[PDB]
Design a protein around this nucleic acid. Structure first.
Ligand SMILES: CSCC[C@H](NP(=O)(O)CO[C@H](C)Cn1cnc2c(N)ncnc21)C(=O)O
Ligand SMILES: [Mn+2]
Ligand SMILES: [Mn+2]
Lengths: 555, 411
DNA sequence: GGTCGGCGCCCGAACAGGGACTG
DNA sequence: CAGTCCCTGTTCGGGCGCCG
């Protein structure tokens, strides 16, 4: 076997484990002909070699059809070898995006045919990549081969190929620094600002540079004219868009059909603005069977019909001009949902997106907006390497009050207020000083761990009092209930004194939405007030009415 | 032609496998220009995916510094080699460094590149450089010399460093020199002028051996932030309720704090804004509690074997308080910062500045870096903290969410 | 078909660590 | 006192989408 021009990558097995020994799957006769036709062709090209009984290893093998072609793709079920193969560090750190491409005078795309079959495998590791090709007769012993290149299905092949491909492109890109080569596996996006005459030469130079190492660039996959098909998009000289997306129109929806729908909706949200998958993802909660039929809710049918109407109109993104600033604008869509557009010129979106994660049992719009800004910031650094300037639906004075008075550290990068309702705001403000002339409520609540019974109430400075029995409750629920009672029975201004750190900590964070309906009721009462002053005192110290109302709610 | 010092990981532990986080354009261009030049000098060489280890990498600029500085987050590799730089080649910590009138810091990380690294250990120094928009796969490297930011580098170079500093230590015996990570702490009681001159004498003394910049500290002027009680002519029910709760919390630190007579003033269900005259029994309980807060806590002393812990509280208006301790309520030091960079506009820049100042003080006083409890959300911190980092070390930290109780540390 | 690696989303279960009450 | 549980937050396993 001749030596490949590419330097091999030394690969070891994990210490203390041998190669795989798995029996071959029963293959269809139409797939057997495709394998023997490919195996005999790769054997002639030196990519696989015959092996005798001295190789005690074996692994299953199969094949799937290539998309939009009559050719076949050979795949190996290396699930047992991948378990016992050494760990690799993947060099593919992410996926390129067209919104990060800059305008170039010339663009060329070309794919490498049978990319894994042109990069050699480690000589000492080829013995473990043994497989058996079953013949048309079950009594025939079959032909046994071993891989001399990178197999398809082994966990090390993609990491080895990407590093090998980068090493071969280094001498060309070093000699041609003004040539941009987007390298995703074997897909090469080549662009330049050279004149179109000199560009065609450099493309041919690159096709020969790759040819000197065994990498073939077929003229079939060669692309010289726009629109270019690259990474699932359509690249035009002035704009880009995703390749056509098809959503299923099932009359009876299963759980797996929703997962296929939700995934395509997320994929479409990168350029199609306003995609919502809140109500459709609510169909996947608490469900077990992937094939179980589930009916669409009224909120899910409306959300789906809105997404289909957005996908009817054509949308496109633009490319990145480093000479102009990056701008990200966010909108409060639904409760818990946020959308954003990243652009440089008005209505010329580089890309779009959405944020809808619910963090914690109690939150407000300011927290979620801060989380969305961070998600966009990290996303922008990946694509453009910089943080955009933000346009946020929150008053400058609103944000100033929040971050200065909040006990956690928080910050938003350089941003400006855009007046687009609904505007994010704080729905209520706790006073920093006790209110003169307002009734002072001393609240407390307790419960029993066993009987699950408890009391909640208050004692005020005007003699007002209340105690309410509670069933199936906790110490935390009662102490929240006592504050809720003091809010119901007070005027527009009230001073409330509690000893519950748990209850006080939740309210001071100014939540406007909660998983607990009790907290929501507390919120609704807090919004109706004009001045609220909460205050904490230590318990069991005989302080004011806190000791009196503790003995009242003792049982 | 230098012999390598054999280094091993701790028994039953593998190397670091930490994913690289996204980097800005200015940091990637800086890292490429630095790593290309470091490869040209043999300090690093490219590797492949067969190395399963990796450590994050980013770039910083020190205070008033224009040049970018490569920084590797070797925190995970340092945890997995702890027995090396503590048991075998430990570096003693001078107790007099904190008592000097002036202490200057010198970045001597460039000297580590002169010593080769053990061949078997180079596999763990791996790191990957990302690309904008993932134009190319990751460009992986590994170190061929002693890496900056690794706690094994000053331990191996310790023998070489002692012989370089011996001529200077002999001429200047009253000057204290401490080496922590890539930094050199030089402390003296000299006048500012001749002190900075003695620094420049050491700078030229280090240039002739194959090695700049200084950060001045004055540990003698480091002050602590005690627990203070308000001095009011008129007290209200709310004032005394807040006073009792604060004294109740402070009683966990000072066992002599009493709130009996003060709680007796809060017997009735009174309005918060009502003025309450202090009884003479309560006035003495308040004055005696003030006297206790001036005296130090009993049985508080540093333990060399225990980890340092640092808590930070956001007090608003650019105020930031902190306490350093090893056991709860046994604070080895308390303090307060104010008017730092980013005050009244950027909490993360202020918090980043606070962590650096606290870590710097912990190195001078004990020679350790504390683990921080940060009053910030994890995603808020991990999004911006590298934008404001100006130090060659990185402390360990965790994130807490403690809503304010009784403002114990700031009036 | 039920191969691999990357990145993204959604969900629930398992993990985990602090706070107030109890033998 | 240590030992619960009530509560809350984080991490991870697994499905889909997308690319080669
Ligand atoms: C019209 S289908 C695309 C044709 C493609 N081109 P290629 O070989 O140059 C480059 O692909 C390499 C092998 C990556 N890779 C792609 N798909 C798979 C897969 N399913 N399993 C494992 N590795 C895969 C091919 O042949 O796989
Ligand atoms: Mn190809
Ligand atoms: Mn209670």
């Amino acid at each position: 076997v001749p030596i490949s021009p590419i330097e091999t990558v030394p690969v070891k097995l994990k210490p203390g484990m041998d190669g795989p020994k798995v029996k071959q799957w029963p293959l269809t006769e139409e797939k057997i002909k495709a394998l023997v036709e490919i195996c005999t062709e790769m054997e002639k090209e030196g990519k696989i070699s015959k092996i005798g009984p001295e190789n005690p290893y074996n692994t299953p093998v199969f094949a799937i059809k290539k998309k939009d072609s009559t050719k076949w793709r050979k795949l190996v079920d290396f699930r047992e070898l991948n378990k016992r193969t050494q760990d690799f560090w993947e060099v593919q750190l992410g996926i390129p995006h067209p919104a990060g491409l800059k305008k170039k005078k010339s663009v060329t795309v070309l794919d490498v045919g049978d990319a894994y079959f042109s990069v050699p495998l480690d000589e000492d590791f080829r013995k473990y990549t043994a497989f058996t090709i079953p013949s048309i007769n079950n009594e025939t012993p079959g032909i046994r081969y071993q891989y001399n290149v990178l197999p398809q299905g082994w966990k090390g092949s993609p990491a080895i190929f990407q590093s090998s491909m980068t090493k071969i492109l280094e001498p060309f890109k070093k000699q041609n620094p003004d040539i941009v080569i987007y390298q995703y596996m074997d897909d090469l996006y080549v662009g330049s600002d050279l004149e179109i005459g000199q560009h065609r030469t450099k493309i041919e130079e690159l096709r020969q540079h790759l040819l000197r190492w065994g990498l073939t660039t077929p003229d079939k996959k060669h692309q010289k004219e726009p629109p270019f098909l690259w990474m699932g998009y359509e690249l035009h000289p002035d704009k880009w868009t995703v390749q056509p997306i098809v959503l299923p129109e099932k009359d009876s929806w299963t759980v797996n059909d929703i997962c296929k729908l939700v995934g395509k909706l997320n994929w479409a949200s990168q350029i199609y603005p306003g995609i919502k998958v809140r109500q459709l993802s609510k169909l996947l909660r608490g469900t077990k069977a992937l094939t179980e039929v589930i009916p669409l809710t009224e909120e899910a049918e409306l959300e789906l019909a809105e997404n289909r109407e957005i996908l009817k109109e054509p949308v496109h993104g633009v490319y990145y001009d480093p000479s102009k600033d990056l701008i990200a604008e966010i909108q409060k869509q639904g409760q818990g949902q946020w959308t954003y557009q990243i652009y440089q010129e008005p209505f010329k979106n580089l890309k779009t997106g959405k944020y809808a994660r619910m963090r914690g049992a109690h939150t407000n719009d300011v927290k979620q907006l801060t989380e969305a800004v961070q998600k966009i910031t990290t996303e922008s650094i990946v694509i453009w390497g910089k943080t955009p300037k933000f346009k946020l639906p929150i008053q400058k004075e609103t944000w100033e009050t929040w971050w200065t008075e909040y006990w956690q550290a928080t910050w938003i990068p350089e941003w400006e207020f855009v007046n687009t309702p609904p505007l994010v705001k704080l729905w209520y403000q706790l006073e920093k000083e006790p209110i003169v002339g307002a009734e002072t409520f001393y609240v407390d609540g307790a419960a029993n761990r066993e009987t699950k019974l408890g009391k909640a109430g208050y004692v005020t400075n005007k003699g007002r009092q209340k105690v309410v029995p509670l069933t199936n409750t906790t110490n935390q629920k009662t102490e929240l209930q006592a504050i809720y009672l003091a809010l119901q029975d007070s005027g527009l201004e009230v001073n409330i004194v509690t000893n519950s750190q748990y209850a006080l900590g939740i309210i001071q964070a100014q939540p406007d939405k909660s998983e607990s309906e009790l907290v929501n009721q507390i919120i609704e009462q807090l919004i109706k007030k004009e001045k609220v002053y909460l205050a904490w005192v230590p318990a069991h110290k005989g302080i004011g009415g806190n000791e009196q109302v503790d003995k009242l709610v003792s049982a | 032609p230098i012999e390598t010092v054999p280094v091993k990981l701790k028994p039953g532990m593998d190397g670091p496998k930490v994913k690289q986080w996204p980097l800005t354009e200015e940091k990637i261009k800086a890292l490429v220009e630095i790593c290309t030049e470091m490869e040209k000098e043999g300090k690093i060489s490219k590797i492949g995916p067969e190395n399963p280890y990796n450590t994050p990498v980013f770039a910083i600029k020190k205070k008033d510094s224009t040049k970018w500085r490569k920084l590797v987050d070797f925190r995970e590799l340092n945890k997995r080699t702890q027995d090396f730089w503590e048991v075998q080649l430990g570096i003693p910590h001078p107790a007099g460094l904190k008592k000097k009138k002036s202490v200057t810091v010198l970045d001597v990380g460039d000297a580590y590149f002169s010593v080769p690294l053990d061949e078997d250990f180079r596999k763990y120094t791996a790191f990957t450089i990302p690309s904008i928009n993932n134009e190319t796969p990751g460009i992986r490297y590994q170190y061929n010399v002693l890496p900056q930011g690794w706690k094994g580098s000053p331990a191996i170079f310790q023998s070489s460093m002692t012989k370089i500093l011996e001529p200077f230590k002999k001429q200047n015996p009253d000057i204290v020199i401490y080496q922590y990570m890539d930094d050199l702490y030089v402390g003296s009681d000299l006048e500012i002028g001749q002190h900075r001159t003695k620094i420049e004498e050491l700078r030229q003394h280090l240039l002739r051996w194959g090695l700049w910049m200084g950060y001045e500290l004055h540990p003698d002027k480091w002050t602590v932030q005690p627990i203070v009680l308000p001095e009011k002519d008129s007290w209200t029910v709310n004032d005394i309720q807040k006073l009792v709760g604060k004294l109740n919390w402070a009683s966990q630190i000072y066992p002599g704090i009493k709130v009996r007579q003060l709680s007796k003033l809060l017997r009735g269900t009174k309005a918060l804004t009502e003025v309450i005259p202090l009884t003479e029994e309560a006035e003495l309980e308040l004055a005696e509690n003030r006297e206790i807060l001036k005296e130090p806590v009993h049985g508080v002393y540093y333990d060399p074997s225990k980890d340092l812990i640092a808590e930070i509280q956001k007090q608003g208006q650019g105020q930031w308080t902190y306490q350093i301790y090893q056991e709860p309520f046994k604070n080895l030091k308390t303090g307060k910062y104010a008017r730092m960079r980013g005050a009244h506009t950027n909490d993360v820049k202020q918090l980043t500045e606070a962590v650096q100042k606290i870590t710097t003080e912990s190195i001078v006083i004990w020679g350790k870096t504390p683990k921080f409890k940060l009053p910030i959300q994890k995603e808020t911190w991990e999004t911006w903290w590298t934008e404001y980092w100006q130090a060659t070390w990185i402390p360990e930290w965790e994130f807490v969410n403690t809503p304010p109780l009784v403002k114990l540390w700031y009036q």
